[PDB]
Amino acid sequence: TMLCVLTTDAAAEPAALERALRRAAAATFDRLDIDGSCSTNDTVLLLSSGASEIPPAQADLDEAVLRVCDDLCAQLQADAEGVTKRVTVTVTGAATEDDALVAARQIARDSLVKTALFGSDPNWGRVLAAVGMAPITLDPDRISVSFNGAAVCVHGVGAPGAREVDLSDADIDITVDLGVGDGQARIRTTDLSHAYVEENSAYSS
Amino acid sequence: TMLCVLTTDAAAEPAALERALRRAAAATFDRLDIDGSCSTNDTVLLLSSGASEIPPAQADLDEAVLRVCDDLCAQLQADAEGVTKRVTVTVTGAATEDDALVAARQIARDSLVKTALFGSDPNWGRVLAAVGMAPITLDPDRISVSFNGAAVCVHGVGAPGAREVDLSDADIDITVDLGVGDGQARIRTTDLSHAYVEENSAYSS
Amino acid sequence: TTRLLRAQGVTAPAGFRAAGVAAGIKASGALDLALVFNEGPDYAAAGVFTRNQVKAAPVLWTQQVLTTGRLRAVILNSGGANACTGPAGFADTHATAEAVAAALSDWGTETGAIEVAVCSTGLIGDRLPMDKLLAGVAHVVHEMHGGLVGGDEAAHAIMTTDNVPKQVALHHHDNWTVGGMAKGAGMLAPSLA
Amino acid sequence: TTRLLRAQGVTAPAGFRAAGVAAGIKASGALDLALVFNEGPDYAAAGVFTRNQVKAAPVLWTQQVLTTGRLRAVILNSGGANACTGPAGFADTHATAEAVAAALSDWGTETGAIEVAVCSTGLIGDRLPMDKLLAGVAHVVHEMHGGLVGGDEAAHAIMTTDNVPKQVALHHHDNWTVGGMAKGAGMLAPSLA
Ligand SMILES: NCCC[C@H](N)C(=O)O
Numbered sequence: 001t002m003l004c005v006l007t008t009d010a011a012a013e014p015a016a017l018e019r020a021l022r023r024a025a026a027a028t029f030d031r032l033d034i035d036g037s038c039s040t041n042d043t044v045l046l047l048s049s050g051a052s053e054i055p056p057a058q059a060d061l062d063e064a065v066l067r068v069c070d071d072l073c074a075q076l077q078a079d080a081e082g083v084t085k086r087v088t089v090t091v092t093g094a095a096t097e098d099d100a101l102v103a104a105r106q107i108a109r110d111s112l113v114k115t116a117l118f119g120s121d122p123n124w125g126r127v128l129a130a131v132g133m134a135p136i137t138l139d140p141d142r143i144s145v146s147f148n149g150a151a152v153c154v155h156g157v158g159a160p161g162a163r164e165v166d167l168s169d170a171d172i173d174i175t176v177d178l179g180v181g182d183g184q185a186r187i188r189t190t191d192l193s194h195a196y197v198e199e200n201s202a203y204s205s
Numbered sequence: 206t207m208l209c210v211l212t213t214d215a216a217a218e219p220a221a222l223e224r225a226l227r228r229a230a231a232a233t234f235d236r237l238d239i240d241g242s243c244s245t246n247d248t249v250l251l252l253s254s255g256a257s258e259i260p261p262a263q264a265d266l267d268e269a270v271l272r273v274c275d276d277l278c279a280q281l282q283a284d285a286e287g288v289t290k291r292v293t294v295t296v297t298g299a300a301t302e303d304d305a306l307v308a309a310r311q312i313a314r315d316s317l318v319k320t321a322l323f324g325s326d327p328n329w330g331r332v333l334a335a336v337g338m339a340p341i342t343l344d345p346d347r348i349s350v351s352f353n354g355a356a357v358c359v360h361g362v363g364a365p366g367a368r369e370v371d372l373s374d375a376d377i378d379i380t381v382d383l384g385v386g387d388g389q390a391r392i393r394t395t396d397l398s399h400a401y402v403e404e405n406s407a408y409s410s
Numbered sequence: 411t412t413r414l415l416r417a418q419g420v421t422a423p424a425g426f427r428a429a430g431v432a433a434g435i436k437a438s439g440a441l442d443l444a445l446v447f448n449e450g451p452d453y454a455a456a457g458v459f460t461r462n463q464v465k466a467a468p469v470l471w472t473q474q475v476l477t478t479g480r481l482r483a484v485i486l487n488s489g490g491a492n493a494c495t496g497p498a499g500f501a502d503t504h505a506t507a508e509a510v511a512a513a514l515s516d517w518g519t520e521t522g523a524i525e526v527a528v529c530s531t532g533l534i535g536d537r538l539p540m541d542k543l544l545a546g547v548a549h550v551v552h553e554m555h556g557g558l559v560g561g562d563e564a565a566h567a568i569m570t571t572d573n574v575p576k577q578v579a580l581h582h583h584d585n586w587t588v589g590g591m592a593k594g595a596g597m598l599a600p601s602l603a
Numbered sequence: 604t605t606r607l608l609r610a611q612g613v614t615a616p617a618g619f620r621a622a623g624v625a626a627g628i629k630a631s632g633a634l635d636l637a638l639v640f641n642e643g644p645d646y647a648a649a650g651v652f653t654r655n656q657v658k659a660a661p662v663l664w665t666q667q668v669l670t671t672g673r674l675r676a677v678i679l680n681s682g683g684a685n686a687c688t689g690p691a692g693f694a695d696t697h698a699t700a701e702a703v704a705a706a707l708s709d710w711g712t713e714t715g716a717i718e719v720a721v722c723s724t725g726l727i728g729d730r731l732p733m734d735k736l737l738a739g740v741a742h743v744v745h746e747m748h749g750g751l752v753g754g755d756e757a758a759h760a761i762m763t764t765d766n767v768p769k770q771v772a773l774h775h776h777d778n779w780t781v782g783g784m785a786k787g788a789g790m791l792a793p794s795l796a
Pocket residue numbers: 001002039199200205491531532533570571594595596597
């Protein structure tokens with residue numbers, strides 16, 4: 001479960017706080033996916049005391065809430081159950097914005113991607129297996145993948161040196177281009193480790 | 206990847222084999238879900254030599270192929286990478302049969318359900334969390350859950366005797382009734398264990 | 411210059427008190443109950459919630475409360491999600507909202523139940539140990555302050571499987587602040603509306 | 604008395620030969636090439652394949668082949684998926700079918716590539732070692748027979764991360780038989796059409 005309380009002494013009406021919370025959550029919380037299990041208790045609350053008596057322009061309210069949520073998301077990612085890799089999955093070149101998000105979630109949730117990432121293996125094949133299952137417009141010929149900047153997959157086939165890519169560092173960036181439009185999306189995830197399994201099986205939580 | 210070759214000496218034209226195979230595949234392989242990762246190589250083939258010169262009635266051809274595929278599925282489940290629990294997930298009482306299948310797949314694929322099962326933990330909460338995310342007709346007040354024939358949750362709340370069920374045995378049935386129709390379906394799955402993580406992280410496959 | 415700062419929480423902006431107490435909900439005796447308190451003048455609020463069709467009582471309650479756009483406070487416990495607990499469970503949530511409202515009226519502010527938001531996290535299917543929780547409410551209302559260590563105790567108290575709390579505050583250059591605490595390490599894939 | 608029996612496989616029905624050989628595709632030297640051969644008189648076939656939008660060259664080949672409803676043979680390798688290998692990958696599948704069809708013609712049954720189904724399984728992205736594969740093809744056409752041990756070997760040969768093989772055969776009381784082998788232990792969630 002993810003609980004989140006946001007307080008502000010900025011002055012805004014309920015309609016204005018709703019805007020800032022809905023845009024922020026949609027762009028951050030809705031894109032934080034650690035183990036694919038959505039809980040029965042998730043709440044984000046935005047409270048205004050207005051004690052500064054300054055009413056900001058909407059975009060300044062939006063932006064500020066957005067950035068607070070994002071940073072919380074990063075801290076959440078960094079302290080996920082048994083995390084050893086802070087994985088960001090970006091999908092670009094999709095047919096629509098939604099397609100990209102669906103592609104990114106598909107990759108981030110996949111047991112094989114996550115266990116490969118845990119062992120520092122740049123098993124890019126598993127990434128392509130995963131994304132091929134996403135209910136989106138896809139051309140297996142036009143897919144490219146980079147792990148931490150280094151290309152591992154070029155137009156559907158292996159890029160020279162792929163299996164040599166170093167993934168021993170905690171941070172891992174995955175960019176997947178689908179070359180079918182320009183929709184794009186990013187998901188924060190983590191790996192599937194022994195520590196995640198021990199923690200979720202050794203005791204009731 | 207799942208590869209399967211079926212052979213038969215029954216006399217039967219391609220269209221006869223096609224019906225048998227498609228019916229068999231839908232009821233068996235399409236309902237085998239070990240780790241939720243669908244391959245790029247999955248193939249099932251059915252060949253006929255006609256060497257018996259006996260053309261069976263189509264229902265008996267269908268039936269024979271189904272029984273063969275179904276037993277193969279059991280074997281596949283029994284030998285799954287790092288398997289400690291042979292898990293059957295049954296959803297009954299759904300609005301339609303597809304909803305039941307979708308609900309059972311949601312349960313079977315969930316990381317917290319699988320890890321609970323690895324730990325022999327009859328955690329019905331985790332099952333409820335998971336099923337709540339399935340895109341189907343659902344009344345949360347009407348759901349019941351049983352492990353190995355023991356009702357641990359009825360009418361959406363805990364049943365007396367719940368956190369006392371013994372799941373130490375390797376075979377585990379989860380049965381979930383939705384109470385909103387007569388649709389039902391059954392998935393074969395397995396637990397998420399240390400060995401599964403180990404096998405998929407220590408080396409490349 | 412607009413500075414985004416960690417180790418700073420919900421008490422960073424003005425018009426807010428918070429604390430966190432060991433009510434005894436968690437066996438460990440760790441911090442498990444947290445309050446956030448809007449001090450006015452304004453009482454505006456927005457919320458978004460899990461789209462899961464199994465929604466815990468605290469959520470269904472807080473969703474009703476939030477149709478008014480007003481909040482005086484938020485009470486949050488860990489050591490129990492109070493989910494799948496039926497009519498009685500929903501009543502525990504209401505009795506929490508009411509004991510908070512009362513404890514605030516006895517502290518100095520005229521607060522009723524429909525102004526208090528409720529949140530829970532932890533195991534699903536268990537009932538809250540209410541005599542500890544209600545006693546927690548009295549103690550936490552008594553201990554709330556506007557200082558930073560208030561955001562802290564609170565951020566600490568909402569943790570379940572977390573190893574460290576999650577805090578951030580943005581001090582905007584036009585002299586207002588947005589602060590935040592969050593929790594959650596597992597069963598973590600928000601689908602909010 | 605209709606009976607379903609394990610320890611029996613693809614050479615249980617009459618009209619089929621099978622074999623499995625070690626080709627050196629696997630660094631381990633374990634079995635990795637399987638052949639299933641239809642002796643006749645009939646050659647009727649049906650196929651279903653992964654609905655994954657990324658399909659391996661063998662899947663692509665075998666889908667075109669099955670539009671005829673006709674098969675004489677299935678050639679299956681472990682130790683490499685031949686997936687995500689592009690046009691060159693497809694050419695390798697074509698050449699496998701072609702070598703299988705040439706070896707069977709030499710052996711004494713006229714066969715074209717279009718009558719040969721090709722399967723692969725293993726790592727995604729790696730190219731197949733063709734010299735080793737094509738040497739195995741020659742070998743396996745020469746070892747194939749209708750004995751149950753032929754089925755066994757074909758069944759062992761298709762294994763990747765499996766520890767035991769999978770075989771079953773249903774003997775129907777009207778004296779026809781359905782036999783079968785399977786493999787797969789991970790990346791296991793078929794969605795077939
Ligand atoms: N191990 C996963 C526990 C999930 C629970 N909703 C919590 O937040 O503690």
